Amino acid sequence: SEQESVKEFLAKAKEEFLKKWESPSQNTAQLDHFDRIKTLGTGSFGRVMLVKHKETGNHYAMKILDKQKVVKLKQIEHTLNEKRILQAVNFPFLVKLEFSFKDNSNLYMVMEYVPGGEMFSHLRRIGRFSEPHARFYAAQIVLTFEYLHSLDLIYRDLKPENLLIDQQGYIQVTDFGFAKRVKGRTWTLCGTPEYLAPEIILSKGYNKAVDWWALGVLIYEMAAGYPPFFADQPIQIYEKIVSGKVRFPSHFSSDLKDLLRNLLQVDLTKRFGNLKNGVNDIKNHKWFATTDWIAIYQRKVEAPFIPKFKGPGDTSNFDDYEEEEIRVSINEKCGKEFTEF
């Protein structure tokens, strides 16, 4: 019986998660253990660099967060949360945290390097994915949300920008600052405009169903090449989202449109993933009839697309940035705020 096997698997996974949540790892490397290779990304309070571990030669992505900037932009809780989640979860489609540490100036999260880069750039380059291609990625997100929701985590950050494609063509989910434990409801206005469920926009108390809405947005964008609700300004996007109207490209299959009508459902009593049968309403939908869910989880399905890779440290799938210093102050900054990191 697969159902009993899934229940046992998820109960074991929850025990392991809670153990690691209660006793997080800390201070498992230091900066001079690494050589910097290239800046892979920049943000308002941090950067991501390709680094090489001097002792082993292994490549990693090092997320470097400026503590003072985190404090300025009110991201203390999100940043502490991301690291605590990353060191506690364990699932094939979630990025792996290898080391973490801090110094006078910065917080550091060292993760396995995924040279294939973001789904976003591959999607924009190719234009759109065929439905079998979109379905392959969609299935991995379904299973990832089944795992996260079983831990009572709402993800709240789904978009192609936050999905990496690894060397076997499978997805790695990257970001967890917004992942909150919610057994009941929560209220924060957060996410990315195109991916916000209507109940978030309408300032309602909301739950894990917002992730299944976001899955609908992701599937639509992957298959069409553009998201279902867009406009010049976020407020105009929000008006479209809450309207309950959506149009589909003529090349969308009937099965795809039916799935999307049930995921992009403004009424929570009708949205797939939020009904009595839960995720099984999605897994058993006709669009997924050819999906071997166990084989996806085991990464035994041949990926439809493998990114170009010329070595463990190739950076060709990432943008080019001006290389700036990593300055570490002589004075400790914000020590109390980040004591638990």
């Binding site: 996410g191 990315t192 553009y226 406009a231 490209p249």
Partner: peptide, 18 residues
């Protein structure tokens, strides 16, 4: 086309969280 309208929206690059 709808694609053209998407390009006209200007939100074709990486999107920030609110």
């Amino acid at each position: 086309t709808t694609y053209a309208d998407f390009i006209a929206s200007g939100r074709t690059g990486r999107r920030n969280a609110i």
